[PDB]
Amino acid sequence: KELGKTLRRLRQGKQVSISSLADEHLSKSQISRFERGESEISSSRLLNLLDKLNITIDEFVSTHSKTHTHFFTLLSRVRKYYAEKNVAKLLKLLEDYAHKDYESTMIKAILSSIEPTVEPSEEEVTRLTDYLFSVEQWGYYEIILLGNCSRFINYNTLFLLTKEMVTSFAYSEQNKTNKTLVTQLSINCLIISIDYSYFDHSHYLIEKIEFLLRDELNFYEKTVFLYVHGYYKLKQGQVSGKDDMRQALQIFKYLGEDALYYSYKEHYRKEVL
């Protein structure tokens, strides 16, 4: 509808003629009618055009519109209403997703942190975990659902799901945005393993987190891991973990991350001191 106009603008900005893009299975008329909005074009031909023009399909669609993934839109709306503490609008979003079981479960799980009246039932959570167990390629969808619902999942199932998510990611194409989320959820499961004294699970998650952080930047996850791993060493007898936690606090302080600094500081004063 308007995809053609986006293609024309980017194509012309690169000074690439339509005649230079045409070949045996892509004519100049097919490109022109698409750019003019007079005809659609096959997805394989668009991907061929974007490849010749060195435009990722992600850059192409995001230039056209921000409305192309309803799940990500739902996450941004929830992110907005949660910051506003807009209870009413979150419950309205819950009514929009009443026919979507997993999404409504996730909305109710997020809603509970600011309104204990709303809570996902155990049958709803079990349906979600059953879905996540049956998934063999963990994607952005699955990772976000687990992370935003982990508070209503028992530790045994949460650790089993985490291990399968990490394993599934290791055999994947290694999407970098998903890697970051998989790393953050593994650290969140590591925290709970240390607090509950499941040091066998803790040692396992530590080795996977180190693997996920290797040859990556991701200084935020490394900073959180420094604190959490030091917390593990403090409960294992090593007093050096106390130095690790203090260094992680200094990192938050030096970078002006006041919210993270004060959030971890009171945790350091409660469970360590």
Summarize as ranges the residues that interact with its own copies (CB under 8 A): 1, 3, 9-10, 12-15, 40-47, 50-52, 54-63, 65-66, 68-72, 76, 131, 134-137, 139-141, 170-178, 217-220, 222-223, 226, 247-248, 250-251, 254-256
Q: How many angstroms from the chain centroid is the CA of residue 188?
A: 14
For its own copies, the closer of residues 111 and 245 by Cβ is: 245
In the bound complex, what is the minimum distance in angstroms from residue 231's beta carbon to its own copies?
15
Residue linked to tokens 């007898």: 237
Closest alpha carbon to 128 in 120, 119, 139, 136: 120
Furthest C-alpha separation in the chain? 73
DSSP state of 150: G
Structure tokens at 107: 């909305």
- Cβ atoms of 143 and 181 within 8 Å: the answer is yes
Please give the angle made by the CA atoms of 142, 146 and 147, to the nearest 5 degrees.
115
Quickly count: other Cβ atoms within 10 Å of residue 209's Cβ.
24
In the bound complex, what is the minimum distance in angstroms from residue 96's beta carbon to its own copies?
15
In the bound complex, what is the minimum distance in angstroms from residue 103's beta carbon to its own copies?
9
For its own copies, the closer of residues 47 and 98 by Cβ is: 47
For its own copies, the closer of residues 43 and 117 by Cβ is: 43
- Cβ atoms of 178 and 169 within 8 Å: the answer is yes
Dist CA 202 CA 196 (whole Å): 10
Kindly provide the b/e burial profile for residues 220-245, where b requires at least 16 CB atoms within 10 angstroms of the residue's own CB.
bbbbbbbbbbbbbbbbeeeeebbebb
In the bound complex, what is the minimum distance in angstroms from residue 43's beta carbon to its own copies?
4
In the bound complex, what is the minimum distance in angstroms from residue 144's beta carbon to its own copies?
9
Dist CA 32 CA 41 (whole Å): 10
For its own copies, the closer of residues 45 and 267 by Cβ is: 45
For its own copies, the closer of residues 202 and 223 by Cβ is: 223
In the bound complex, what is the minimum distance in angstroms from residue 198's beta carbon to its own copies?
26
For its own copies, the closer of residues 107 and 226 by Cβ is: 226
In the bound complex, what is the minimum distance in angstroms from residue 176's beta carbon to its own copies?
7
Dist CA 200 CA 5 (whole Å): 57
In the bound complex, what is the minimum distance in angstroms from residue 139's beta carbon to its own copies?
5
Dist CA 250 CA 36 (whole Å): 57
For its own copies, the closer of residues 114 and 255 by Cβ is: 255
For its own copies, the closer of residues 115 and 216 by Cβ is: 216
